[PDB]
Amino acid sequence: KIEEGKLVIWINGDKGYNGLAEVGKKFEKDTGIKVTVEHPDKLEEKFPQVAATGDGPDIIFWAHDRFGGYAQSGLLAEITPDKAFQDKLYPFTWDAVRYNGKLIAYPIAVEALSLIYNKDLLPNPPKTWEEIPALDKELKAKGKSALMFNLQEPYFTWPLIAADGGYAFKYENGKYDIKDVGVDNAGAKAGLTFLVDLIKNKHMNADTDYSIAEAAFNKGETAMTINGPWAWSNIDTSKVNYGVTVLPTFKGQPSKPFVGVLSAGINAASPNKELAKEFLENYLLTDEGLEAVNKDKPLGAVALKSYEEELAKDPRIAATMENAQKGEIMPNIPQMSAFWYAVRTAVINAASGRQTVDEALKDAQTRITK
């Protein structure tokens, strides 16, 4: 039971606060409803504290992965965006926020991975995964390494398997297959095989993580680095020209790194569903509101086509959104998240040498089909 007549909004992201806060003010100005915007980071540890007591915000934002636990806990209220919004919602992302064949959530922001590399040093990046350890090899004798993936965590080992195209990479005439299981493919096995073998070959480091790479970036321990665009904010400490290319190679043909679409829900414990309703439909999912939020967050973030139509004007973002279709949208489905975690444990058991690639993806398969 959340207090009536109030709108508490737990925003989720690096910034975006002022943008959404100003939108919250506009809501309060027109409705008279007191709006409180905040960002209690570490929801993984903090959210449960209010979730288990029937408390929390009225509106709350989650990552494509983290959201699955939000709906799983049963704190997600039914959400029905304006019919026009559902039309402006692309099938790729509109289905991504469904569950049990029902629309349960709405997207707010779109992010994707990539291959960030030192362009000044090597303007020609690895064309494929076989050319990743090629640069680790050249630096191997130099006491350095090109690849700086988080390998202690499954962050950059899960998509390593998926990158090959044998796992979590489907397409059917404007649709995606998230019912099949990819870990049983040799392509999926190859990705995990690459991990383990290249660790033994002293090109990859299972110990390397965010904090190690971050320190390496600030200290300048290596001549170059290969990592995602999320780590680029730490990579660019060197103040040199870093370039970007396609990280994954899908059946021998690269296209576009996987696209993680952030989404938000409404607290079931909120009696203020009408306040979240009006805010959502009138403000949050309005081009003006999306622009306000993207005042602090990257402009690439988009909820509706109606805003993507304005992003089409941007030579760079338009091309990104076009190429985004060449990848796959990550659904916020609770079951899909659990299916990913099945592999996220497999990649670590194999990296640590607890079990083989076959055994690792065997256990993953079982967990996915469970």
From Swiss-Prot:
<dbReference type="GO" id="GO:0016020">
    <property type="term" value="C:membrane"/>
</dbReference>
<dbReference type="InterPro" id="IPR006059">
    <property type="entry name" value="SBP"/>
</dbReference>
<dbReference type="GO" id="GO:0034289">
    <property type="term" value="P:detection of maltose stimulus"/>
</dbReference>
<comment type="function">
    <text>Part of the ABC transporter complex MalEFGK involved in maltose/maltodextrin import. Binds maltose and higher maltodextrins such as maltotriose.</text>
</comment>
<dbReference type="GO" id="GO:1990060">
    <property type="term" value="C:maltose transport complex"/>
</dbReference>
<dbReference type="Pfam" id="PF01547">
    <property type="entry name" value="SBP_bac_1"/>
</dbReference>
<dbReference type="GO" id="GO:0055052">
    <property type="term" value="C:ATP-binding cassette (ABC) transporter complex, substrate-binding subunit-containing"/>
</dbReference>
<dbReference type="GO" id="GO:1901982">
    <property type="term" value="F:maltose binding"/>
</dbReference>
<dbReference type="GO" id="GO:0008643">
    <property type="term" value="P:carbohydrate transport"/>
</dbReference>
<comment type="subunit">
    <text>The complex is composed of two ATP-binding proteins (MalK), two transmembrane proteins (MalG and MalF) and a solute-binding protein (MalE).</text>
</comment>
<dbReference type="InterPro" id="IPR006061">
    <property type="entry name" value="SBP_1_CS"/>
</dbReference>
<dbReference type="GO" id="GO:0042956">
    <property type="term" value="P:maltodextrin transmembrane transport"/>
</dbReference>
<dbReference type="InterPro" id="IPR006060">
    <property type="entry name" value="Maltose/Cyclodextrin-bd"/>
</dbReference>
<dbReference type="GO" id="GO:0030288">
    <property type="term" value="C:outer membrane-bounded periplasmic space"/>
</dbReference>
<dbReference type="GO" id="GO:0060326">
    <property type="term" value="P:cell chemotaxis"/>
</dbReference>
<dbReference type="GO" id="GO:0042597">
    <property type="term" value="C:periplasmic space"/>
</dbReference>
<keyword id="KW-0732">Signal</keyword>
<dbReference type="GO" id="GO:0043190">
    <property type="term" value="C:ATP-binding cassette (ABC) transporter complex"/>
</dbReference>
<keyword id="KW-0574">Periplasm</keyword>
<protein>
    <recommendedName>
        <fullName>Maltose/maltodextrin-binding periplasmic protein</fullName>
    </recommendedName>
</protein>
<comment type="similarity">
    <text>Belongs to the bacterial solute-binding protein 1 family.</text>
</comment>
<keyword id="KW-0762">Sugar transport</keyword>
<dbReference type="GO" id="GO:0006974">
    <property type="term" value="P:DNA damage response"/>
</dbReference>
<keyword id="KW-0813">Transport</keyword>
<dbReference type="GO" id="GO:0015144">
    <property type="term" value="F:carbohydrate transmembrane transporter activity"/>
</dbReference>
<dbReference type="GO" id="GO:0015768">
    <property type="term" value="P:maltose transport"/>
</dbReference>
